[PDB]
Design an enzyme around this catalytic site. Structure first.
Site, mmCIF file in Angstrom:
data_model
loop_
_atom_site.group_PDB
_atom_site.id
_atom_site.type_symbol
_atom_site.label_atom_id
_atom_site.label_comp_id
_atom_site.label_asym_id
_atom_site.label_seq_id
_atom_site.Cartn_x
_atom_site.Cartn_y
_atom_site.Cartn_z
ATOM 1 N N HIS A 1 0.794 -1.230 0.000
ATOM 2 C CA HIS A 1 0.000 0.000 0.000
ATOM 3 C C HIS A 1 0.830 1.286 0.000
ATOM 4 C CE1 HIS A 1 -0.084 -0.015 4.627
ATOM 5 N NE2 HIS A 1 0.325 1.203 4.319
ATOM 6 N N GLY B 1 2.752 6.495 9.714
ATOM 7 C CA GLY B 1 4.076 6.267 9.156
ATOM 8 C C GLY B 1 4.810 5.054 9.721
ATOM 9 N N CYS C 1 3.819 1.819 9.333
ATOM 10 C CA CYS C 1 3.675 0.630 8.449
ATOM 11 C C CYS C 1 5.010 0.232 7.910
ATOM 12 C CB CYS C 1 2.680 0.909 7.326
ATOM 13 S SG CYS C 1 1.073 0.932 8.040
#
Lengths: 4, 306, 301, 4
Positions: free
Chosen positions: B41, B143, B145
């Site tokens: 993603h 932020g 991930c």
């Protein structure tokens, strides 16, 4: 849901 | 003496954390040899996240469109592909800090350490458990991930988690390092919810053994229970059903303390139906469920890592 | 979202850990540049421990009597001296893994991460607080001495603790990186007792702000209180008195949550007087006091 | 106290  | 929830030393993992940026989307990646792994993603800017067709959305991307950053150094991406929910970037430099490692998929209940990262910069480390409902109760901001969870065995890092999302209840969901989600979750900003969660019975029992090992043993009694009778009681308190497989896993802790697992289950049953009555156990007022049987052995045994 | 007892990443410190052996005694040491710091009691034997004289014991040693190993590899000791309760050993090579660092003495109530080590090898890392009585509630087995506590800012490691001793209650004592003990403890095996501990009020308030920031809100109330009224109550429950300075420190979290510090104090006051009654806050059934205001701000940004 |  949140894509973090 | 003392008994603390501990994370593994994170150095070996710190050496692998990089920054991956597509447009205005910046998240973390895991650099092992000449491959960088990150959440797919990352390629989404703005609201693409509603119902992304990753396969097609990826086909448009080029190599030069990924900005991979390790320290002050930009890594040249010379290849890219998708593996389930992960993006795989090939870079022109094999990470000199690559530790010995392994990708593993863990089971609900099992614990691991999480190195929380932002912009490729490790920021904090904590120990947690894969909940029975397949989420983790982490602590992540925007932020984060790409942050990973892992264990260490001797000198080998077992990577077992990469972080993808936060659910409405404030808990977290992600994948193994093959990109396959833990739980029924998918990587889109649609409505998804975690199932009702239960207490990790196997771990509570391990912890009670830990307590006994440390001389904290007031809760022990001279009775036993059948497995079935234990479960009838414990499931009313929202505990995972205990299986014979679980009983066997507690074998070594049982042998060490000389306390049969069902005798301990009787202690736990009495504790659930009666509470502690002001007393504590390993300094806790709560029955702990984030230590596995193996965690208990490793700690009570001063295990180190090379 | 979420709130965890989080430690600093330990890598920068791992690369500084070494093993120091004297005769049959092995402990951890900290290797920065060409110096290895370790607890001086590495030079004591069983007999020497009730009442050692470290000046006597040290003079009877040469460079050659110290076995320093980084991993399997021995480092040649070319110098030694004592700085308070620490030994300093010069070695003939520099640690290329040495981070930007400094030595700092922290105050009670502050937090730091501990890299627990054995035989110079990292075992685990955990976050804790320096209790008001100068002890730490650590997890330390035999051979953990020389393990260090630290904080990190940007890329700079602030070493604040080196482990030396376990007290009879099972809590822990050590020094800063100049070898000065926290608290009135000495490095000898006599009965020593910690002062009565107390709850770190400032941190409890920070943790209640963390709760509020993560949706845990039931404990809030309509009331407010004064500093003096709050202190009269908290002190009954063995809570540290709160000062204006401490109120000021809670400012940013106050602004972020829209809850006035003294309103948060009234909330805490009712909690102390009425208990929690089955309820939990951020998963806990007791008030946590090992998070500073800065910790809460950092994790909950 | 025990020297640890």
């Amino acid at each position: 849901a949140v894509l973090x | 003496s003392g008994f603390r929830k501990m994370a593994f030393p994170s150095g070996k993992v710190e050496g692998c954390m990089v920054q991956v940026t597509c447009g205005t989307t910046t998240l973390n990646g895991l650099w092992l040899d000449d491959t960088v792994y990150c959440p797919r993603h990352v390629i989404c800017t703005a609201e693409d996240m509603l119902n992304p067709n990753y396969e097609d959305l990826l086909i448009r991307k080029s190599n030069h469109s990924f900005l991979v950053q390790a320290g002050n150094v930009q890594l040249r991406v010379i290849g890219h592909s998708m593996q389930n929910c992960l993006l795989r970037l090939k870079v022109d430099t094999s990470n000199p800090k690559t530790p010995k490692y392994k990708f593993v998929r863990i089971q609900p209940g099992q614990t691991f350490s999480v190195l929380a990262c932002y912009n490729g910069s490790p920021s904090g480390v904590y120990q947690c458990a894969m909940r029975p409902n397949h989420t983790i109760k982490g602590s992540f901001l925007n932020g984060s991930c790409g942050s990973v969870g892992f264990n260490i065995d001797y000198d080998c890092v077992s990577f077992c988690y990469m972080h993808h999302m936060e659910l409405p209840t404030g808990v977290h969901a992600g994948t193994d390092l093959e990109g396959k989600f833990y739980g029924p979750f998918v990587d889109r900003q649609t409505a998804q919810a975690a199932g009702t969660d239960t207490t990790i019975t196997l771990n509570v029992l391990a912890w009670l053994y830990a307590a006994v090992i440390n001389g904290d043993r007031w809760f022990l009694n001279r009775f036993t229970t059948t497995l079935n009778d234990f479960n009838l009681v414990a499931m009313k308190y929202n505990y995972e059903p205990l299986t014979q497989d679980h009983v066997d896993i507690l074998g070594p802790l049982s042998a060490q303390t000389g306390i049969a697992v069902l005798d301990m289950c009787a202690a736990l049953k009495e504790l659930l139906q009666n509470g502690m009555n002001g007393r504590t156990i390993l300094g806790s007022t709560i029955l702990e469920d984030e230590f596995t049987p193996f965690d208990v052995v490793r700690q009570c045994s001063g295990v180190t890592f090379q």
